[PDB]
Write a protein that holds these residues in place. Structure first.
Motif, PDB file in Angstrom:
ATOM      1  N   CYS A 203       0.825  -1.196   0.000  1.00 22.61           N
ATOM      2  CA  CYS A 203       0.000   0.000   0.000  1.00 22.61           C
ATOM      3  C   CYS A 203       0.864   1.252   0.000  1.00 22.61           C
ATOM      4  O   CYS A 203       2.060   1.227   0.297  1.00 22.61           O
ATOM      5  N   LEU A 204       0.242   2.377  -0.331  1.00 17.15           N
ATOM      6  CA  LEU A 204       0.912   3.659  -0.185  1.00 17.15           C
ATOM      7  C   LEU A 204       1.054   4.034   1.283  1.00 17.15           C
ATOM      8  O   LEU A 204       2.050   4.649   1.677  1.00 17.15           O
ATOM      9  N   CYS A 205       0.070   3.659   2.103  1.00 18.18           N
ATOM     10  CA  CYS A 205       0.101   4.000   3.521  1.00 18.18           C
ATOM     11  C   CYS A 205       1.205   3.254   4.249  1.00 18.18           C
ATOM     12  O   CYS A 205       1.942   3.843   5.046  1.00 18.18           O
TER      13      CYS A 205
ATOM     14  N   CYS B  26      -5.455   5.003   2.840  1.00 20.59           N
ATOM     15  CA  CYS B  26      -5.088   5.700   1.622  1.00 20.59           C
ATOM     16  C   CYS B  26      -5.915   5.295   0.415  1.00 20.59           C
ATOM     17  O   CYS B  26      -5.863   5.989  -0.601  1.00 20.59           O
TER      18      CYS B  26
ATOM     19  N   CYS C  29      -7.003  -0.723   1.066  1.00 24.30           N
ATOM     20  CA  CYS C  29      -6.682  -0.133   2.355  1.00 24.30           C
ATOM     21  C   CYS C  29      -7.666   0.976   2.711  1.00 24.30           C
ATOM     22  O   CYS C  29      -8.229   1.652   1.849  1.00 24.30           O
TER      23      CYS C  29
ATOM     24  N   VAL D 122      -5.772   2.712  -1.672  1.00 20.79           N
ATOM     25  CA  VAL D 122      -5.135   1.965  -2.748  1.00 20.79           C
ATOM     26  C   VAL D 122      -5.564   0.509  -2.635  1.00 20.79           C
ATOM     27  O   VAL D 122      -6.002   0.061  -1.571  1.00 20.79           O
TER      28      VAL D 122
HETATM   29 ZN   LIG Z   1      -2.874   1.601   2.256  1.00 20.94          ZN
END
Ligand SMILES: [Zn+2]
Ligand SMILES: [Mg+2]
Ligand SMILES: [Zn+2]
Ligand SMILES: [Zn+2]
Lengths: 49, 50, 72, 102, 1343, 94, 72, 248
Positions: E55-57, E73, E70, E75
């Motif tokens: 994920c980006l988070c 964020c 998620c 994604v």
């Molecule tokens: Zn995420």
């Protein structure tokens, strides 16, 4: 260059279209050996982590 | 890209790179000099009467 | 093998020769077979042309042999 | 320029791809584990397939594998360490030790 | 997997359907962490994760979370390669016109709304208001209302008046426009509007309308309201070194659109004044234009670089675009390059691969064979082992390399022998070693060329390599079937040196038991290599049932010819090596070995030829020296003679007897004749030496001088360069085309001084500039011919036609430039060819005319063979295997699925690059031979004095011997003074015709009295008073200075009786008056005794180069088209000089609507009472090719072009089989125009594909209805390639935007079916070994 | 009609220079944006509007695609912008 | 082909084409006309001794060359 | 030392390489007598009367070098740098006429035609019709095979479209352009051309399923659809053009 004891004759296709047939004495006497100084750098940059 | 008769003494008729730019890049001749104004001047020895 | 001249005249078409020899070489390489002509330390695609050369692999012979492999 | 009228997009390389030497190394490691796990019995290979994520999308924990067999995660940890010590031996790790980059 | 690709217009709902979100901010990344943003341009909620399964988070970073979204964020945990394929959308706050559908030049929106382009571009940029369904309030729907006019017309009308400006207006116009309602009303007014421009515009609009209903697109989809963004991996933001970055320009264009849309969103949220929102909407529309095509509106906006940005159109279109530069021209794994060397120990089927290159190319092969034999356990262990290159991996690699071809390819790949497959032999060093015979097939010398070598991976490609691309499978040139593996320079010097006799050599007159004794005598040093002996020779002849009948004789040969006889195979006679054996002789020897024995013994023979040629050229010791240029001793005298001559003409120009132009011409001619004299003296000094002897007397013989031995053998160069070595250099040219009149009296065995060396450099620099400019445009014609002939593949075994061209050799005047055995060989007989006794069939039908059949019909002296041609094949989207003929690169009949369109494109392009890249133009009949005269169109009259003058028009001369074939073929003038009678076989050395261009008489048919009626001097004639003898002349005038009282009226040449009774025409009840066109020299009087055929009224008086084969295929209309006789029937003139004369050919049984606007400056061949049929000559000069197709058959423009193109090829000396121009012509004129639409489903004014016409007319005649007739059309090869069927193919050689807009609005489909289509798409071609795969997939559709 | 004679002269000789268009522009239009818009209008025929006297081979090498319907609608444009003077599309100028 | 052999073929085509195009303009054999074909002037006998077949005189041909110097 | 093909000489009319070769035989002719005289430690009356003779040859040359006014340790120094061979200046349009070479060749005991009789190295019997030898100044050009040899099985790829990289330094592939595709369609090599646009170039799934298949020992590609064409498909669909793939 170098002064090469040359001859002018066909010799078995090994100098056929434009080619050159070269003695082993030319290589042995090191008449055409050339130095080539390469630089090769490594950079430490600043990555993020 | 051609060679003109005013190239005598000033630029080499022979030496140009063959390929895409032949005659576009020249080579200055041996005794060739530039003028006051910017032209290519080449020495000639003066002939008198005879 | 140098030339496929006997092979292309024994089939009659140059491209279907490539397809038939490719099928036979696939059977000989991964399909699980034995070479019909003895391989004289040839690669798999030269045995296929030497099986086509001796009349032993055509399209219908390969197809009836596929029928017989399905038969068990 | 003046190469093939090449632009700066022609020379930027992707590093986040998968090079086919590492991928067939990864693929042959998948089968080289499957033959070393062919040298284990029913229980010990299966916990070692579900403590990590071998053909299942977890990586269960010590109690979660012990949840399947009603063991309080201690014999499950030992039978993992028993099978891990079982794979430590020469002529048990003769293909896998070569699979590590040395 | 998909079987077709369908193009349409994108629905706005469909654009939102592709999307995975909306891009709202013009931020790209975080600027600090370089991370994708929350809803930016490189979003991650929309397009995906930056790392694979992370994920980006940072929370759901595990590979156990695959597929989840998620919560922090937004994604989805997927691969990061999913953002190569994920789009988003931009919902534009205002509608905006697609600039592809507006600023195209047909302008589909403009053509659709029945408003010109200035209308819509005025309304779209907010100038004019537009009525959309304006009620009944004194208006017109689709009308321009300028702002003040809209305001003052809104007055007195409380109706809401329905006037918008901008793309809201054009969208509500496009939505409210009913296409089918307008189609019915347009056809309703089409019921009542048969005009030219009116009906033309109505059907021209109704074509796009009927396409738009049958497609399924909506017209409101051309006005865009929601905008698709590209995936981020197609406009990436790659992090480079040192903190620096690099983006694509589409990022800037999408940033401009997102900026202007956010600002317009605020400006419509803010209830701003209308002028700034007009400017904002116009700016956003301009930003959409700059994004989709930066430059179709003007100008292409530049960023911080001063080049324009690359837009989406520029990413599909252009030379660097994906359609050109990335869908075919693409780099390739398992490939490498190095320089070529010779290494002539090789066979014809092997190249010398280096060992580091074979270690690198064959890496996965090496790994599989290395771990299969188990010398490594891990592929990491295999990698470390072959990185170490241990002593076993060379054994594994030489096992791998054994029968595994490598595609050796050199870069200017003009034809298919630029790629051949070779078995690799491992050599050390780093250069590819390459068999010396195929150097003439790649045009690859050893001044440093590099050959790229590829590897065929699959067993199908290994077998394609071995079965098609092996260098022994391709030893015939595919252009013309002559062998391309001709021994080139050292081999021919060896074969010429060993087989050329000497008068007194060692070991003369011995008798040897055979070639074994000859080699034993030569190798021991008892006999020389060329000593005339009597060898006993066993030569085998298969002049029986494939027998190889042997016969042993006692030949009178030399020793070296006997030694060379050992390498000859059986089927060849001894007389083929009993000669000098130059270059053409080895070509003919290898050709004879192929034609007799087939393919494999030719390969073994060419290898043994190469080995023997190199070996005996080595043992020649054939040097070159400074005494091998013997300067002729008469050269000083010829130079002094020419200097005395130009001194004399310099005097006579100083004396003013001749001018400076004639003096320059005379000194150019004098110095050129002196240069020919000097070359003749040195060539006669060089080719004859004096040797002595068996008896001690002087005896001339052909000299062994090595420069003559190189020039005469065809080893390297010819006698022109030997002229520039020993004889004088000559007159040197200029880049202006002019000739420098001070020649070069020196040469290259002496020196050149500074002036002559400065003179030479103009011509040499022009020659090298034109060489290096031609190589930058090498295969432009090959490209232009593969575009027209991409999709022509042999699909049928025998279509079964009866038509075809009837082939006869090029007898132009005297000799025949190219005989019948050149042309009719390999082609298929379209009919049964009978003997000259017209009694027995020689070759039955459907026969491959090989060299036995052509030898038979040339022994039977047959002359008129009707071959089966490609332009008359009865099959569709292809040719049959017999209407083409044979393969010419193999000698067999052609296979099903050979791409003969591409092969013929290459076989016109690759011999065509041997042509000049710049173009260049250059009494009594000489009766030589004897025999019978044949005449067609023969209507001759007797004269009183025994002479003859032919009064029929096209009676041209044909001389036949007692063999059937034509001997002397010439054009007889209209009434030249013949000493030829009729039909009687005459002897050679007696003139048949005394022509004079000052003499074109109107010689009578019957004798009588030429009295003149309707004859008035002054308004019909000039006053011609010849003081020369004092004769009565009446020389008639044109329409220049006579009256209009006698302009339309014609003076009578009426030949009457001795009493004055009007004699009839024999055959015709008309009178005898021969009324005259302009400028006839008449000597007559009223009432003079003249005979039949009397000279009443006499009338007074080859380009080469590659641009000619450019202009012959583009089918240019020449500025002087020789006008024809459009319809059969006798002729009359027309209106005199309304600029142009008219001329009414009147058919005696048909209507005469043709009074053709003939200019008076192009003078008539014909008289105005002279019957000419259709397809007959009127003007003189270059005949236009379209007029040959309209008037004469399709075999008459086929015969015209392939004789006019081969007149360019045979002019320079390049041979090519004329199949190759016929498959290009067959793909040229595949357009027919309809004239009678009939029960066939085409319009009248309709140009369509001919083989769709010939199959609908096949089927609509297969019912009980009748089908259309069609007039064939012929087009240029840049215009025939325009009308392809595909749109994926057509967008790769034509302009993509005009193609893709024309494809989208038609809702077009592409069932793939084409070579360039499937190559782009990634499938097998429908040509080669993938023909059966396109059978295997066209089997499953008829399931 | 002068720009129609420019179209006819370009298709009658196979090329256009800058001198021939600049002699066949009207009298009323001034600045260089609209005239090179007209150059684009005549340039996508394409009659090869380039600077100087063209070469000899490059009219037979350069091709004329596609006759004639793009040229039909371009004639519809070019015979109709001989009337108004205030036409440009630039948002800055407008 | 060494890139200076195709130069050789281009240069020899240039020289031969130009020299043949000049030598075709010498009008070798003809008729003794004795009078010019644009002036009717008596062409002198030494001029026909130089060129057999001069239908133009010396200075009318000079005018023809001066008119043809540019073109048209 | 170097055997050369004589066929390049008559057509490419550079006769000046035969004249230099004969002047190379003369220059190394002088040098093998100055070497032979120093080999025996000949007195300077032998040296100063040969080398002054060698420095004074041919018609009326502008160079007048008089070794009579030369120091004796300068002459043996001059003879040390001539024991390889006397250098010959041939000015550009001014220098050695053909007779001055043969006269300089006759100062050696070398044959004045330029050509000696050469014997074959391997088999020992002579080449007949004697052969030109001499001393050409051969260069070594900056086109080495160490900088031009390149090969690649599978290296780094390009990010933007997934093709192999460009150039020898980037471990690159060979460009298989338009003309190499038509010359492949001119055969029947369908399968060879499908893999040169799918497996060996850009199809990312099909190119790693090949490298596993070759190491497995299975030469069968499962190619599919290239990555130059999905990038092309998304760029037309980033216009408002619904170009889509049908179904079979
Ligand atoms: Zn995420
Ligand atoms: Mg070369
Ligand atoms: Zn047919
Ligand atoms: Zn005159």
């Amino acid at each position: 260059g170098q002064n090469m004891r040359v001859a002018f004759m066909p010799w078995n296709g090994y100098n056929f279209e434009d080619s050159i047939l070269v003695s082993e004495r030319v290589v042995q006497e090191d008449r055409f050996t050339t130095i080539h100084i390469q630089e090769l750098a490594c950079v430490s940059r600043d990555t993020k982590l | 890209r051609d060679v003109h008769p005013t190239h005598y003494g000033r630029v080499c008729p022979i030496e140009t790179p063959e390929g895409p730019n032949i005659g576009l890049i020249n080579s200055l001749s041996v005794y060739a000099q530039t003028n006051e104004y910017g032209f290519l001047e080449t020495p000639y020895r003066k002939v008198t009467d005879g | 093998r140098v030339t496929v001249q006997d092979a292309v005249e024994k089939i009659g078409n140059r491209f279907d020769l490539v397809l038939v020899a490719a099928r036979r070489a696939r059977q000989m390489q991964v399909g699980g077979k034995d070479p019909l002509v003895p391989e004289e330390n040839d690669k798999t695609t030269v045995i296929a042309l030497r099986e086509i050369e001796e009349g032993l692999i055509n399209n219908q012979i390969l197809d009836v042999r596929e029928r017989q492999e399905q038969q068990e | 320029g003046d190469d093939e009228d090449s632009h700066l997009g022609d020379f930027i390389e992707d590093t986040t791809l998968e090079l086919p030497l590492d991928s067939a190394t990864t693929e042959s490691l998948r089968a080289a584990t499957h033959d070393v796990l062919a040298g284990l019995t029913a229980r010990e290979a299966k916990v070692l397939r579900m403590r990590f994520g071998i053909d299942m999308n977890t990586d269960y924990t010590l109690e979660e594998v012990g949840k399947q067999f009603d063991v309080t995660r201690e014999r499950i940890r030992q039978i993992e360490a028993k099978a891990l010590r079982k794979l430590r031996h020469p002529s048990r790790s003769e293909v896998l030790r070569s699979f590590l980059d040395d | 997997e998909f079987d077709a690709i369908k193009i349409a217009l994108a629905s706005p709902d469909m654009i939102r359907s592709w999307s995975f979100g909306e891009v709202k901010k013009p931020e790209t990344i975080n600027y600090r962490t370089f991370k994708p943003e929350r809803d930016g341009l490189f979003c991650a909620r929309i397009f995906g994760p930056v790392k694979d399964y992370e994920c980006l988070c940072g929370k759901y970073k595990r590979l156990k979370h695959r597929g989840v979204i998620c919560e922090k964020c937004g994604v989805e945990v997927t691969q990061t390669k999913v953002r190569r394929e994920r789009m988003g959308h931009i919902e534009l706050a205002s509608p905006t016109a697609h600039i592809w559908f507006l600023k195209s030049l047909p302008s589909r929106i403009g053509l659709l709304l029945d408003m010109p382009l200035r209308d819509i571009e005025r309304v779209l940029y907010f100038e004019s208001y537009v009525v959309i369904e304006g009620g009944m309030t004194n208006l017109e729907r689709q009308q321009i209302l300028t702002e003040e006019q809209y305001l003052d017309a809104l007055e007195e009308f409380g109706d809401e008046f329905d006037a918008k400006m901008g793309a809201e207006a054009i969208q509500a116009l496009l939505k409210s426009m009913d296409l089918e309602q307008e189609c019915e009303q347009l056809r309703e007014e089409l019921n009542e509007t048969n005009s030219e421009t009116k009906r033309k515009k109505l059907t021209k609009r109704i074509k796009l309308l009927e396409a738009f209903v049958q497609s399924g697109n909506k017209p409101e989809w051309m006005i865009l309201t929601v905008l698709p963004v590209l995936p981020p991996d197609l406009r990436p933001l790659v992090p480079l070194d040192g903190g620096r970055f690099a983006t694509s320009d589409l990022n800037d264009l999408y940033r401009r659109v997102i900026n202007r849309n956010n600002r317009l969103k605020r400006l419509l949220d803010l209830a701003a004044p209308d002028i700034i929102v007009r400017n904002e909407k116009r700016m956003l529309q301009e930003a959409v234009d700059a994004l989709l095509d930066n430059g179709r509106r003007g100008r292409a906006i530049t960023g911080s670089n001063k080049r324009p940005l690359k837009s989406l159109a520029d990413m599909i279109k252009g030379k660097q675009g994906r359609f050109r530069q990335n869908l075919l021209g693409k780099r390739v794994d398992y490939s490498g390059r190095s320089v070529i060397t010779v290494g002539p120990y090789l066979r014809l089927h092997q190249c010398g691969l280096p060992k580091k290159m074979a270690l690198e190319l064959f890496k996965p092969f090496i790994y599989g064979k290395l771990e299969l034999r188990g010398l490594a356990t891990t592929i990491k262990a295999a990698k470390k082992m072959v990185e170490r290159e241990e002593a076993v991996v060379w054994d594994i690699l030489d096992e791998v390399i054994r029968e595994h071809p490598v595609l050796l390819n050199r870069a200017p790949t003009l034809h298919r022998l630029g790629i051949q497959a070779f078995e690799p032999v491992l050599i050390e060093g780093k250069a590819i070693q390459l068999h010396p015979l195929v150097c003439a097939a790649y045009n690859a010398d050893f001044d440093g060329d590099q050959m790229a070598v590829h590897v065929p991976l699959t067993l199908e490609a290994q077998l394609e390599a071995r079965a098609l691309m092996m260098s022994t499978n391709n030893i015939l040139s595919p252009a013309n079937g002559e062998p391309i593996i001709v021994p080139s320079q050292d081999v021919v010097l060896g074969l010429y040196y060993m087989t050329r006799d000497c008068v007194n050599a060692k070991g003369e007159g011995m008798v040897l038991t055979g070639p074994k004794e000859a080699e034993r005598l030569y190798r021991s040093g008892l006999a020389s290599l060329h000593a005339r002996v009597k060898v006993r020779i066993t030569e085998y002849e298969k002049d029986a049932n494939g027998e190889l009948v042997a016969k042993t004789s006692l030949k009178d040969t030399t020793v070296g010819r006997a030694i060379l006889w050992m390498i000859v195979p059986k089927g060849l006679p001894y007389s083929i090596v009993n000669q000098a054996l130059g270059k053409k002789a080895i070509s003919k020897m290898l050709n004879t070995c192929y034609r007799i024995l087939g393919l494999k013994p030719t390969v073994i023979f060419a290898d043994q030829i190469m080995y023997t040629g190199f070996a005996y050229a080595a043992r020649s010791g054939a040097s070159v020296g400074i005494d091998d240029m013997v300067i002729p001793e008469k050269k000083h005298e010829i130079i002094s003679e020419a200097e005395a001559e130009v001194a004399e003409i310099q005097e006579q120009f100083q004396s003013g007897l001749v001018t400076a132009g004639e003096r320059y011409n005379k000194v150019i001619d004098i110095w050129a004749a002196a240069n020919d004299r000097v070359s003749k003296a040195m060539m006669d000094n060089l080719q004859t030496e004096t040797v002595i002897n068996r008896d001690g007397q002087e005896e001339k013989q052909v000299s062994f001088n090595s420069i003559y031995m190189m020039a005469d053998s065809g080893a390297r160069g010819s006698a022109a360069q030997i002229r520039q070595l020993a004889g004088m250099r000559g007159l040197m040219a200029k880049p202006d085309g002019s000739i420098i009149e001070t020649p070069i009296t020196a040469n290259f065995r002496e020196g050149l001084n500074v002036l002559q060396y400065f003179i030479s450099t103009h011509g040499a620099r022009k020659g090298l500039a034109d060489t290096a400019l031609k190589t930058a445009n090498s295969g432009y014609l090959t490209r232009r011919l593969v575009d027209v002939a991409q999709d022509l593949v042999v699909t049928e075994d025998d279509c079964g036609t009866h038509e075809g061209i009837m082939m006869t050799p090029v007898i132009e005047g005297g000799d025949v430039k190219e005989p019948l055995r050149d042309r009719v060989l390999g082609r298929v007989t379209a009919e049964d060819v009978l003997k000259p006794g017209t009694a027995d069939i020689l070759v039955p039908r459907n026969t491959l005319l090989h060299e036995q059949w052509c030898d038979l019909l040339e022994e039977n002296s047959v002359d008129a063979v009707k071959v089966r041609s490609v332009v008359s094949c009865d099959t569709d989207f292809g040719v049959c295997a017999h209407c083409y003929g044979r393969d010419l690169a193999r000698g067999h009949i052609i296979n099903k699925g050979e791409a003969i369109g591409v092969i013929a494109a290459q076989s016109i392009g690759e011999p065509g690059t041997q042509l000049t890249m710049r173009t260049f133009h250059i009494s009594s009949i000489q009766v030589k031979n004897k025999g019978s005269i044949k005449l067609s169109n023969v209507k001759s009259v007797v004269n009183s004095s025994g002479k003859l003058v032919i009064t029929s028009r096209n009676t041209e001369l044909k001389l036949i011997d007692e063999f059937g074939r034509t001997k002397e073929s010439y054009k007889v003038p209209y009434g030249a003074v013949l000493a030829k009678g009729d039909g009687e076989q005459v002897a050679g050395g007696e003139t048949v015709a005394n022509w004079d261009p000052h003499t074109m008489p109107v010689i009578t048919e019957v004798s009588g009295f030429v009295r003149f009626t309707d004859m008035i001097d002054g308004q019909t004639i000039t006053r011609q008073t010849d003081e020369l003898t004092g004769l009565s002349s009446l020389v008639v005038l044109d329409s220049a200075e006579r009256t209009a009282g006698g302009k339309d009226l014609r003076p009578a040449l009426k030949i009457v009786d001795a009493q004055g009774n009007d004699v009839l025409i024999p055959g015709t009840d008309m009178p005898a008056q021969y009324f005259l066109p302009g400028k006839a020299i008449v000597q007559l009087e009223d009432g003079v005794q003249i005979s039949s055929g009397d000279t009443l009224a006499r009338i007074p008086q080859i380009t080469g180069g590659l641009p000619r084969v450019a202009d012959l295929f583009e089918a240019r209309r020449p500025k002087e088209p020789a006008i024809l006789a459009e319809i059969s029937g006798i002729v009359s003139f027309g209106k005199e000089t309304k600029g142009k004369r008219r001329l009414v050919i009147t058919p005696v049984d048909g209507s005469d609507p043709y009074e053709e606007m003939i200019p008076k400056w192009r003078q008539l061949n014909v008289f105005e009472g002279e019957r000419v049929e259709r397809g007959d000559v009127i003007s003189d000069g270059p005949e236009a090719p379209h007029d040959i197709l309209r008037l004469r058959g399709v075999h008459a423009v086929t015969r015209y072009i392939v004789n006019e193109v081969q007149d360019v090829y045979r002019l320079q000396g390049v041979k090519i089989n004329d199949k190759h121009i016929e498959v290009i012509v067959r793909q040229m004129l595949r357009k027919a125009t309809i004239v009678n639409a009939g029960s066939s489903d085409f319009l009248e004014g309709e140009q369509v594909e001919y083989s769709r016409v010939k199959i609908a007319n096949r089927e609509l005649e297969a019912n009980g209805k009748v089908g259309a007739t069609y007039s064939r059309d012929l087009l240029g090869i840049t215009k025939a390639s325009l009308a392809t069927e595909s749109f994926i193919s057509a967008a790769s050689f034509q302009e993509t935007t005009r193609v893709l807009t024309e494809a989208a609005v038609a809702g077009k489909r592409d069932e793939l079916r084409g070579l360039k289509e499937n190559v782009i798409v990634g499938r097998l071609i429908p040509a080669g070994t993938g023909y059966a795969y396109h059978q295997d997939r066209m089997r499953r559709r008829a399931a | 009609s002068q720009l129609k004679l420019l179209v006819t002269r370009g298709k009658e000789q196979g090329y256009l220079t800058y001198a021939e268009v600049n002699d066949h522009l009207p009298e009323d239009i001034v600045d260089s944006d609209q005239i090179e818009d007209i150059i684009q209008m005549i340039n996508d025929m394409g009659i090869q509007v380039m600077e100087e006297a063209p070469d000899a081979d490059d009219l037979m090498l350069a091709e004329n695609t596609a006759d004639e319907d793009a040229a039909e609608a371009a004639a519809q444009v070019l015979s109709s912008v001989e009337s108004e003077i205030g036409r440009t599309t630039d948002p800055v100028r407008m | 082909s060494d890139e200076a052999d195709e130069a050789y073929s281009v240069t020899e085509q240039l020289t031969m084409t130009g020299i043949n195009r000049i030598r075709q303009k010498i009008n070798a054999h003809g008729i003794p006309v004795y009078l010019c074909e644009a002036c009717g002037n008596p062409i002198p006998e030494a001029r026909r001794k130089i060129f057999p077949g001069v239908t133009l005189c010396v200075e009318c041909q000079a005018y023809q060359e001066r008119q043809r110097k540019h073109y048209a | 030392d170097i055997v050369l093909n004589p066929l390049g000489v008559p057509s490419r009319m550079n006769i000046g390489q035969i004249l230099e070769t004969h002047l190379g035989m003369a220059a190394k002719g002088i040098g093998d007598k100055i070497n032979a005289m120093l080999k025996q430690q000949q007195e300077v009356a032998k040296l100063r009367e040969f080398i002054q003779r060698a420095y004074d040859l041919g018609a009326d040359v502008r160079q007048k070098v008089d070794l009579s006014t030369f120091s004796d340790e300068e002459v043996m120094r001059l003879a040390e740098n001539l024991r390889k061979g006397m250098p010959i200046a041939t000015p550009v349009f001014d220098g050695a006429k053909e007779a001055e070479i043969k006269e300089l060749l006759k100062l050696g005991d070398l044959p004045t035609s330029g050509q000696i009789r050469l014997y074959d190295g391997r088999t020992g019997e002579q080449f007949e019709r004697p052969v030109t030898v001499g001393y050409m100044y051969m260069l070594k050009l900056n086109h080495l095979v160490d900088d031009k040899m390149h090969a690649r099985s599978t290296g780094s790829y390009s990010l933007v479209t997934q093709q192999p990289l460009g150039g020898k330094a980037q471990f690159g592939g060979q460009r298989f352009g338009e003309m190499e595709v038509w010359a492949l369609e001119a055969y029947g090599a369908a399968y060879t051309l499908q893999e040169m646009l799918t497996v060996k170039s850009d199809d990312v799934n099909g190119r790693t399923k090949m490298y596993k298949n070759i190491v497995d020992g299975n030469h069968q590609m499962e190619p599919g659809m290239p990555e130059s064409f999905n990038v092309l498909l998304k760029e037309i669909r980033s216009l408002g053009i619904n170009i889509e793939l049908e179904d079979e």
